[PDB]
Amino acid sequence: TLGNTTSSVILTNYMDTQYYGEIGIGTPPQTFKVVFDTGSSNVWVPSSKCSRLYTACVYHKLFDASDSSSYKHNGTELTLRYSTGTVSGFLSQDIITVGGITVTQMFGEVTEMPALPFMLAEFDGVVGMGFIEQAIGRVTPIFDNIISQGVLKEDVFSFYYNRDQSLGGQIVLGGSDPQHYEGNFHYINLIKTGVWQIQMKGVSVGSSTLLCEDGCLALVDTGASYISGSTSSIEKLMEALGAKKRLFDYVVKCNEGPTLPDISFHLGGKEYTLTSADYVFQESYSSKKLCTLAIHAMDIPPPTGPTWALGATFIRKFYTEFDRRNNRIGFALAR
Ligand SMILES: COCCCCC1(CNC(=O)[C@@H]2CNC[C@H](NS(=O)(=O)c3ccc(C)cc3)C2)c2ccccc2Oc2ccccc21
Ligand SMILES: *[C@@H]1O[C@H](CO)[C@@H](O)[C@H](O)[C@H]1NC(C)=O
């Protein structure tokens, strides 16, 4: 069933690395800062039942079921794994408000939240924008529950991520916002339903296709901060850039940031090009300082990986539309 409704969520941009919006859980609503993640399908927030020995729980908003008149108990144990850390807790049900839409949703109350990395988290929880296939406990994802209401003009959702005092970004549920893109969308069909993953035809450093020559996978992840490849791919890429590997990143000398070549991603029919301005955190131009890149090595395990991931580095240049009706991803140049 389709309606006429489009709904939007204003996002906050934290240092070009974290983009999050707000949701309300319960009656009266308890508000949480959440990441809208196409790379996962579970909704979770920290719990009032999290032990204060977890320092992260001291530093974030906690859902208290005892203050909500609409809460429905479940209790099923749940463990959720991410790139940087793992959370564990139990399932609960309550009303969730996302941009004006009110939906009865099953979500996990997190009772184990490690200080590393959750102390670095500016957001409280996560809202999974993926398919039921990737959902732990085979729990209906929020978008599937929103589609079921028959209010949305279309079964699509769009992402706009700004460059670091105005709008941090925007999510549109049931459409796209033309104020944030230029030209026309170019679509790429998903390899298979269940994942927001597409086929990538090659990666060039300069003009020459130095990587992904025999084809590779690309996960379009709104919950990822960077553009990521396997340890091997990123080693070749960085060697070509003249970047040196540290513990958590690669760096160049700040003076050599503007001289770095363009990086292109062959997706569907087109070439998606990023200049050094799009992938270097250009904090200065000093010969005496090191500058980080917005491209990181990430070994994404099977069945999803080995795969590349196109996170916020890519979405900042290319406004992204996720089409649930036709199992495809659309890109247009972001305004
Ligand atoms: C663009 O804004 C996103 C900002 C949030 C990113 C970010 C980091 N990004 C992430 O975790 C990614 C979010 N999207 C799903 C992805 N899963 S995966 O399939 O690629 C994968 C799964 C397991 C392993 C071992 C490796 C890869 C991991 C985050 C996102 C969602 C959930 C938790 C989370 O933790 C933290 C904790 C601290 C700091 C950043 C994060
Ligand atoms: C928890 O939710 C699932 C559906 O996700 C349901 O089938 C199950 O019976 C629930 N468990 C309890 C104890 O309510």
Contact criterion met (CB below 8 Å) for 185 and 332: yes
Considering the domain architecture, whether residues 145 and 250 belong to the same structural domain is answered as no
Please check whether residues 182 and 290 belong to one and the same domain.
yes
Structural domain for 203, as ranges:
177-334
Rg (CA), the chain: 20
Of 145, 161, 176, the residue that ends a domain is 176
Residues with Cβ within 8 Å of 243's Cβ and at least 6 positions away in sequence, in order, are 250, 251, 252, 293
Q: How far does the centroid of ligand 2 lie from the alpha carbon of residue 106, in Å?
A: 9
Residue nearest to atom 3 of ligand 2 (CA): 74
- How far is residue 90's CA from residue 136's CA, in Å, rounded to a whole number? 11
Rounded CA-CA distance 32/219 in Å is 26
Across 43-61, b (16+ Cβ under 10 Å) vs e yields: bbbbbebbeeebebbeebb
Q: Are residues 185 and 168 in the same domain?
A: no
- Looking at the structure, tell me whether residues 219 and 284 fall in a common domain: yes
Tell which atom from ligand 2 comes closest to the C-alpha of 106: 5
Hey, what are 24's tokens?
A: 């309300």
Cβ neighbours of residue 103 under 8 Å, at least 6 residues apart? 95, 96, 97, 142, 145, 146, 149
- Indicate if 21 and 166 belong to the same structural domain: yes
The residue nearest atom 31 of ligand 1, judged by CA position, is: 223
Q: How far is CA 335 from the centre of its chain?
A: 20
44 touches 80 (CB < 8 A): yes
Q: Characterise 55 by phi-psi region: left (phi > 0), alpha (psi -120 to 50), beta (else).
A: alpha
Q: Which of 71, 73, 91, 144 to mutate to test the pocket of ligand 2 (most atoms within 8 A of CB)?
A: 91
Beta carbons within 10 angstroms of residue 275's beta carbon: 13
Q: For atom 5 of ligand 2, which residue has the closest CA?
A: 139
Same-domain status, 15 and 159:
yes
Q: Is 37 known to be catalytic?
A: yes
State whether 182 and 151 are in the same domain: no
> Measured in angstroms, how far is the CA atom of residue 140 from the centroid of ligand 2?
12
Q: For residue 172, is it within any domain?
A: yes
How many domains are contained in the chain?
Answer: 2
Question: In whole angstroms, what is the distance from residue 200 CA to residue 219 CA?
Answer: 9
Ligand 2: atom nearest CA of 139 is 5
Q: Are residues 192 and 168 in the same domain?
A: no
d(CA 121, CA 95): 24
- How far, in Å, CA of 231 to CA of 216, rounded? 14
Please check whether residues 120 and 220 belong to one and the same domain. no
Same domain for 138 and 244, yes or no, is: no
Q: CB burial class (10 A; 0-12, 13-18, 19+) of residue 4?
A: exposed
Q: Is residue 189 domain-resident?
A: yes
Quick one: how far is CA 215 from the chain centroid?
23
By the 8 A CB rule, do 254 and 284 touch? yes
* 312 assigned to some structural domain: yes
Q: Which ligand is nearest to the CA of 227?
A: 1
Is 221 a catalytic site residue?
A: yes
Q: Which residues pair with 72 in a beta bridge?
A: 93
Task: For residue 200, give the 3-state DSSP assignment.
Answer: strand
Ligand 2 close to Cβ of residue 75 (< 6 A):
yes
Same domain, 196 and 301: yes
Instruction: Let me know whether 169 and 208 are in one domain.
Output: no
Tell me, what amino acid is at 207? S
Whose alpha carbon is nearest atom 14 of ligand 2? 74
3-class secondary-structure state, position 232: helix
The technique is: X-ray
Q: What CATH number corresponds to the domain at position 270?
A: 2.40.70.10
